[PDB]
Amino acid sequence: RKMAFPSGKVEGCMVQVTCGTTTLNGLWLDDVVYCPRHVICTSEDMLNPNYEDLLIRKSNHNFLVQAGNVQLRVIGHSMQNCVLKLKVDTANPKTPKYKFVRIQPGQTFSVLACYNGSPSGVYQCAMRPNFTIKGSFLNGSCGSVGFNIDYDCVSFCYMHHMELPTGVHAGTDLEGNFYGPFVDRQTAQAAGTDTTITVNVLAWLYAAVINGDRWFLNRFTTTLNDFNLVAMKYNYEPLTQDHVDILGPLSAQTGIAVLDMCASLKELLQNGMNGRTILGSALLEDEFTPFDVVRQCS
Amino acid sequence: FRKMAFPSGKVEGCMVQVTCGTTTLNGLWLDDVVYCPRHVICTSEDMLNPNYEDLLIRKSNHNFLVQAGNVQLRVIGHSMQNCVLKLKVDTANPKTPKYKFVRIQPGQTFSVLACYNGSPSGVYQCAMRPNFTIKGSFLNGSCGSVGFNIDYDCVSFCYMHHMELPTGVHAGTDLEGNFYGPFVDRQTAQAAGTDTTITVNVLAWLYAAVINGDRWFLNRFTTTLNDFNLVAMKYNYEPLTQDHVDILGPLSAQTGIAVLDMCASLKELLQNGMNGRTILGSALLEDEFTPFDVVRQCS
């Protein structure tokens, strides 16, 4: 099952930001509120925004920040890439230990979907190789964040900006740099062709074996290069030696060598699932990392 | 569509640990009471056939170590309600949310905050199966973790974790300590009943498909409810109740597809099996999204 991190440390940081007719979510850490810079645009501005130009024309008073029922006064404002940083008169007393990280494609995070500064739901997402995420985000969700938690330190890695016409989602890191070749302009945008996260599919096949599902195994073995030739053919990402090492502990637990699991994956791509399921899925799942599997399989 | 858990913060602030002897499990601290599974009082020898009343008579307040983090909360009273121990403590939890204790029906979903030694580890959505088990991640140390729904800032607690069956599925109680299903808290051979498909949730998923414009399976037929239930059982689907029909009301109004017409559509899929065609990008029907889950994600 996908499992999210407990969200309380992030819930205490969510606020609402309004400018003009537009209300979205912001993240309140110490005395700064971070939010998507498109909060400043009208529906006409979004068609083609010169963001600086819109920004020079706003004052601190054009921003209304609400934390619960209490208003926070904006004393300053600046822009870092596609993120607005609103300095407020009150530091957040509930600020957790935190870091801003830019995540790698294939890594997972928890998303706290929020509307009007109020948390609604929590779920796991993976950063796709084409730098989109398959999330659940409706009107009003912009500025919701993604994060991982290590002990009590929250590593924020995503802030939500956009939904593409295909229904997938795009956003930035907390420095305001988009994942992927996207821009915060209301013009038609498509992602690059997506590919399957090979190391994650392998981690998930290990989870399946751990949970008793083993129909897909064989004694066929393969070399790493021969596996990658097939992976490339089927639009799977390359598997590196680093990935092989990362699968080590799962390989030890099941007694199935990484390259033997590669050989099983190769057969599944070439001759499909035969109307069978793995872990209840009719598809090969690639949104669990090795770390996500081992955290649940012990 | 994604399985989405509720934000867990309101429950995180209620999790404590409870130790009796060498056994540490999780407890739920609401106001000045901590709730936890009564088997915290058992030794390894007590578990094949525990006499819980006699084991508890032996215990005193001073035998229970309740800790919020590493901070001990003094126990000032203790009692047992069904399979739950209630420990009155000297401090009322300042983080107590508005809450209620509810007993859910099979098919209903809830979020689980899996915890170990009083420390929350992860959160995920669960459906109570018709056989009164849940599937999900509950490792050793998870007993006393709770399941809940949140409505308008009120936390409805519905599940407290107790056991893992030989098959790998999980069983537990409501917060009044009454088990869901035929299970008893003793280490005896216990088996889950045969499971079935949650019909009302499959119907909700079909409404979600229709909302999204995927509606090839809609037909011109209707059925009576009795006729549907008799057929559904031959396919290992649960029979529908009047309450199931009522909870489908909002989706039927939103789509204009009468509940009994959707039932006739589902009856056809079951009999004349979907020959290759998919629904919402899935060749299999989903049964773990409730009518409430669907309204939240579609609207």
UniProtKB/Swiss-Prot annotation, chain B:
Inhibited by pyridone-containing alpha-ketoamides compounds 13a and 13b. In turn, alpha-ketoamide 13b (tert-butyl (1-((S)-1-(((S)-4-(benzylamino)-3,4-dioxo-1-((S)-2-oxopyrrolidin-3-yl)butan-2-yl)amino)-3-cyclopropyl-1-oxopropan-2-yl)-2-oxo-1,2-dihydropyridin-3-yl)carbamate) inhibits SARS-CoV-2 replication in human lung cells. Inhibited ex vivo by michael acceptor inhibitor N3. Inhibited ex vivo by compound 11a and 11b. Changing Q187A: Does not affect ability to cleave and inactivate human TRMT1. Residues 1-299 form the Peptidase C30 domain. The active site is at H39, C143. Residues 1-299 are cytoplasmic. It is found in: Host cytoplasm; Host Golgi apparatus; Host nucleus. Changing C143A: Complete loss of 3C-like proteinase nsp5 cleavage. There is a cross-link at K3, K88 (Glycyl lysine isopeptide (Lys-Gly) (interchain with G-Cter in ubiquitin)). It catalyses: TSAVLQ-|-SGFRK-NH2 and SGVTFQ-|-GKFKK the two peptides corresponding to the two self-cleavage sites of the SARS 3C-like proteinase are the two most reactive peptide substrates. The enzyme exhibits a strong preference for substrates containing Gln at P1 position and Leu at P2 position. It comes from the Viruses. Cleaves the C-terminus of replicase polyprotein at 11 sites. Recognizes substrates containing the core sequence [ILMVF]-Q-|-[SGACN]. Cleaves and inactivates human TRMT1, preventing tRNA guanine(26)-dimethylation of tRNAs. May cleave human NLRP1 in lung epithelial cells, thereby activating the NLRP1 inflammasome pathway. May cleave human GSDMD, triggering alternative GSDME-mediated epithelial cell death upon activation of the NLRP1 inflammasome, which may enhance the release interleukins 1B, 6, 16 and 18. Also able to bind an ADP-ribose-1''-phosphate (ADRP). 3CL-PRO exists as monomer and homodimer. Only the homodimer shows catalytic activity. Interacts with host FBXO22; this interaction promotes the proteasomal degradation of nsp5. This is 3C-like proteinase nsp5.
